[PDB]
């Protein structure tokens, strides 16, 4: 404990402003001279422009949030190479393996990548291409 030497660049001496002119952070303390920004609490809102109309007020709102929106956990093909062929994949299996944690509103299997292995898969929705690839490897598909 009399030898502790933490990692280099993990720790760094706090700048201390306003304790001399040789610090370069002295008198004005990095604020300059005499404005709204040199004051305590000085500054303005994050989107203020001097009374010029802000960007957001010069452009229009758009849209609506749907309430019955369905967002689905996105599974690719690359993961499914982890399993020996002829077995059955399921949501419960994909959660147990930690590939998935949140079955958001369902599962969806997308054809990003490739499989090399014959598999029966079952899920809520498939993409056309992933269905094609699974079948082309001799796999099969069920819709839950």
Partner 1 sequence: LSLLKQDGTNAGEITLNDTVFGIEPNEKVVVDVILSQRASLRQGTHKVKNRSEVRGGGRKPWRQKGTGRARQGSIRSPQWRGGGVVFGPTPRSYAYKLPKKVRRLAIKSILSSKVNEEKLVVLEGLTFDAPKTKEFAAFLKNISVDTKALIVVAGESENVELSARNLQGITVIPAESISVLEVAKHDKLIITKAAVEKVEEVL
Partner 2 sequence: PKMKTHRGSAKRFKRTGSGKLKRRHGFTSHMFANKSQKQKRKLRKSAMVSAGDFKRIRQMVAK
Partner RNA sequence: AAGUUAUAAAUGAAGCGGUCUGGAAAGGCCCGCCAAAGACGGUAACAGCCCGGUAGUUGAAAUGGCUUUCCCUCCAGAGUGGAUCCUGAGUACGGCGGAACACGUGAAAUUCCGUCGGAAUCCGGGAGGACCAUCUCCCAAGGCUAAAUACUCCCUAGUGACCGAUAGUGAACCAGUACCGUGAGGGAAAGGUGAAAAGCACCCCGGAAGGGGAGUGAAACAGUUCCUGAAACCGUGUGCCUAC
Partner RNA sequence: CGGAAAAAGCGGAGCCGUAGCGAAAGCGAGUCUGAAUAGGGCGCAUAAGUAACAGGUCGUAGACCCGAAACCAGGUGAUCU
Partner RNA sequence: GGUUCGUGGUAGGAGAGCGUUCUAAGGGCGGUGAAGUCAGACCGGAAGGACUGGUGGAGCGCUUAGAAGUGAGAAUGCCG
Q: List residues binding partner 1 (CB under 8 A).
A: 1, 4-7, 10
Q: Please, what's the b/e burial string for 12-28 (b: 16 or more CB within 10 A of its CB; e: otherwise)? A: eeeeeeeeeeeeeeeee
Site map (CB under 8 A) of partner 2, residues 10-49, x = contact: ------------------------------------xx--
Applying CB under 7 A, which part among 37-45, 51-59, 115-123, 136-144 lies near RNA?
A: 37-45
The site map against partner 2 for 45-74 (x = CB under 8 A) is -xx-------xxxxxxxxx-----------
The answer to whether the beta carbons of residues 89 and 80 sit under 8 Å apart is yes
As a whole number of angstroms, the distance between CA 60 and CA 62 comes to: 6
Q: Which is nearer to RNA, 49 or 86 (CB)?
A: 49
Binding at 32: pick from partner 2, partner 1, Mg ion, none (beta carbon under 5-8 Å per type): Mg ion
Q: Sheet containing 140-143: which strands, arranged edge to edge?
A: 88-89, 120-123, 140-143
């Amino acid at each position: 404990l009399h030898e502790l030497k933490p990692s280099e660049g993990s720790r760094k001496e706090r700048n201390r402003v306003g304790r001399g002119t040789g610090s370069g952070n002295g008198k004005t303390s990095g604020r300059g001279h005499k404005g709204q920004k040199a004051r305590s609490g000085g500054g303005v809102r994050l989107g203020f422009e001097g009374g010029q109309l802000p960007l957001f007020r010069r452009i229009p709102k758009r849209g609506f949030t749907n309430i019955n929106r369905k967002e689905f956990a996105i599974v690719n093909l690359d993961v499914l190479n982890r399993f020996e062929d002829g077995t059955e994949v399921t949501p419960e299996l994909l959660v147990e393996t930690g590939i998935i944690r949140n079955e958001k509103s369902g599962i969806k299997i997308l054809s990003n990548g490739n499989i090399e292995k014959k598999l029966t898969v079952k899920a809520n929705k498939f993409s056309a291409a992933a269905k094609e690839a699974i079948e082309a490897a001799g796999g099969k598909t069920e819709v839950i």
